[PDB]
């Protein structure tokens, strides 16, 4: 019921069209089964004149009816084809829209292929219910109502005998349908987990071939595929087990009216002909009722598919407070007041984190491998909301300013250099879409990026592969820095941006990058200590604790953790 009223509730703005769908199909329903009756009416009149006389008069009506039925059947499909694809488009858009509001944590823990299956497979699974299936539903009930009226006008008592076995046929259907929903739901989630393994291997197939884990990855696929095969057989049987099983239920009715009506014909209650004609009208009653029951199993099949879609359409979103305020005149006043945060919630990452940064200051942060330097960055990004503490940007709190207006003047380059499938020009256009070629070209030359862009076979309009694998790790990092500077942010963060890039190229950018850094609040995180000594305020973090704070020369003379890192270089 939960997804039944939910999925079928998407047809609500198109209710006015659905009434017309019902009207156009009813005409095709009252003329479709009337075809052998239409021929018999003509012959009954032209039984005496044999040929001609009134025969050419009846042929003119017969031809116009079949021409009308063919014109309306195409008309029924055309109006429904657009209506069906609109619901399919709606659920697919709704799935995508929710993902952008849903927190980062979800993406890091759920499989990437699982969402892919939810977008394509799960939406292509509900594509069958939206189409001819809805048309046959309206066609079924009218043929059922059209048969029950013909039934009672011929036989009254015997029509009740055929209707008495109807709730028993529904009773068994309710058991089969529930079992079909029980199996198709499991079929999809297993496929969802299996689809994730496909994306997992494609993104990093080099690692699999090198360690000879190709056999282990094959049996990893086989272990889920065998569970998919075993549950898939049982799901496909239940999907089509109701139609042949209903034949035995129908055959009971054929034997029932032959006995119950046979008892009347013997005692001379109702003539043998009253039962001999009733068998033909009982066939036009059973056929649509079983068709509706078979198409009740298929809706339950789609109900299981729709159930997997609403699982994400019910998942929490990053919401802005109703008293939201847009940040006017951004300068970059970073403020921290005793911040304590836990990433995994099992082990605390950060303990007592506090610092005040003036607008347009150069700030450096360095320490050991796996301390909590990158964690502070994403807290400022508001990817993971503060557990205990206070963070204020430009005098106003992080929670008070809306997520879009807060991130408006924030720029970041990640450890995992991420590149889109789009062109180099469009990738660099991120942040500032209204940036001319003059701004794109000049920025590349300043940070040693243009050197390899012109070297490409296409140039600036070159297509980028999976995570931009067409260029080396160092070249990829340089493009991200250009992308970050092009957006023109007041607050700038460069997380390991100069790790893959060589020390020789780094010196050529060192001064040019610092010349663009002026008038902007900057926070840089990198292990290369001989490139972060230009920073005004330097903070040292170890095991998620602030041990040292102050100028570069002050850290050297004090002889601590900063001194231990600097000396260990050579």
């Amino acid at each position: 019921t939960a997804t039944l009223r939910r999925l079928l509730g998407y047809l609500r703005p198109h209710t006015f069209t659905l009434i017309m769908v019902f009207v156009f199909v009813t005409v095709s329903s009252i003329l479709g089964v009337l075809s052998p009756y239409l021929i018999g009416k003509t012959i009954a009149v032209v039984f005496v004149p044999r040929r001609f006389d009134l025969l050419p008069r009846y042929m003119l009506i017969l031809g116009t009816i079949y021409a009308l039925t063919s014109l309306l059947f195409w008309l029924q499909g055309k109006i429904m084809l657009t209506l069906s694809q609109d619901v399919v488009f709606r659920l697919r858009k709704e799935l995508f829209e929710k993902l952008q509001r849903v927190p980062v944590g979800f993406f890091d823990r759920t499989p990437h292929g699982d969402i892919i299956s939810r977008v394509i497979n799960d939406v292509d699974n509900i594509n069958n219910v939206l189409g001819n299936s809805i048309i046959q539903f309206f066609s079924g009930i009218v043929t059922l109502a059209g048969a029950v009226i013909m039934m009672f006008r011929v036989n009254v008592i015997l029509s009740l005998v055929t209707l008495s076995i109807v709730p028993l046929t529904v009773l068994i259907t309710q058991i089969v349908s529930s079992q079909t929903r029980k199996y198709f739901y499991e079929n999809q989630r297993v496929l969802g987990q299996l689809n994730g393994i496909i994306e997992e291997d494609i993104s990093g197939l080099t690692v699999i071939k090198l360690f000879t884990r190709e056999e282990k990855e094959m049996e990893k696929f086989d272990r889920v595929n065998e569970s998919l095969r075993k549950v898939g057989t049982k799901a496909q049987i239940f999907s089509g087990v109701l139609p042949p099983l209903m034949n035995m239920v129908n055959n009971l009715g054929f034997a029932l009216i032959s006995g119950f009506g046979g008892w009347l014909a013997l005692k001379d209650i109702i003539t043998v002909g009253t039962i001999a004609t009733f068998i033909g009208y009982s066939r036009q009653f059973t056929r649509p009722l079983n068709e509706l029951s078979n198409q009740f199993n298929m809706i339950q099949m789609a109900l299981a598919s729709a159930e997997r879609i609403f699982e994400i359409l019910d998942l929490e979103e990053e919401k802005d407070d109703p008293d939201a305020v847009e940040l006017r005149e951004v300068r970059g006043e970073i403020e921290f007041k005793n911040v304590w945060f836990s990433y995994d919630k099992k082990k605390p990452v950060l303990k007592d984190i506090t610092f005040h940064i003036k607008p347009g200051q150069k700030v450096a942060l360095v320490g050991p491998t796996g301390s909590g330097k990158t964690t502070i960055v994403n807290l400022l990004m508001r990817f993971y909301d503060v557990d205990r503490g206070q963070i204020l940007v430009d005098g106003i709190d992080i929670r008070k300013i809306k997520r879009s207006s807060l991130r408006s003047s924030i720029g970041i380059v990640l450890q995992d250099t991420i590149l889109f499938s789009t062109t180099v020009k469009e990738n660099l256009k991120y942040g500032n879409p209204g940036a001319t070629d003059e701004e794109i070209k000049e920025a590349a030359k300043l940070t040693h990026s243009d050197h390899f862009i012109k070297h490409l076979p296409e140039g600036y309009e070159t297509v980028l592969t999976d995570n931009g694998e067409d260029l080396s790790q160092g070249q990829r990092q340089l493009l991200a820095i250009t992308r970050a500077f092009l957006a023109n942010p007041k607050i700038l963060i460069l997380d390991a941006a100069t790790s893959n890039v060589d020390t020789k190229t780094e010196k050529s950018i060192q001064a040019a990058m610092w010349k663009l850094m002026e008038g902007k609040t900057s926070i840089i995180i990198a292990h290369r200590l001989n490139t972060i000594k230009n920073a005004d305020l330097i903070i040292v973090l170890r095991d998620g604790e602030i041990v040292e704070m102050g100028k570069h020369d002050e850290l050297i003379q004090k002889r601590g953790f900063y001194y231990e890192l600097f000396t260990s270089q050579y």
Partner: nanobody
Amino acid sequence: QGQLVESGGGLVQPGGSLRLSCAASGFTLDYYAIGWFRQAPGKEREGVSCISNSGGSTKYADSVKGRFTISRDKAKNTVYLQMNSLKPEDTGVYYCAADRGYSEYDLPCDLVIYGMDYWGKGTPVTVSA
């Protein structure tokens, strides 16, 4: 459902002290962070003291220093806040905090909360002559 219950105090002339308990239903004082808040009607929403974990955490307010005595129950799950010698400075609807704790850290003091604003229901104890 995760909700808090706040009760205690009536109408006392400035000088006395009132017992105010923040009873938690479906929440234990052994881990979660629950703290009282000095909230005025139509004005700003300040805090009292945010105490968490079974081990215990010492905390008090800055406006009225060392006068909001706190105590925690391990079995009853209640936080008693006895305002030692009341003043008409702090009058209005007081609130408690739900989730955003897990263990023990520092709490200085205001919490996030996505639901409405703060969970516990405001009890008005006006201490004016």
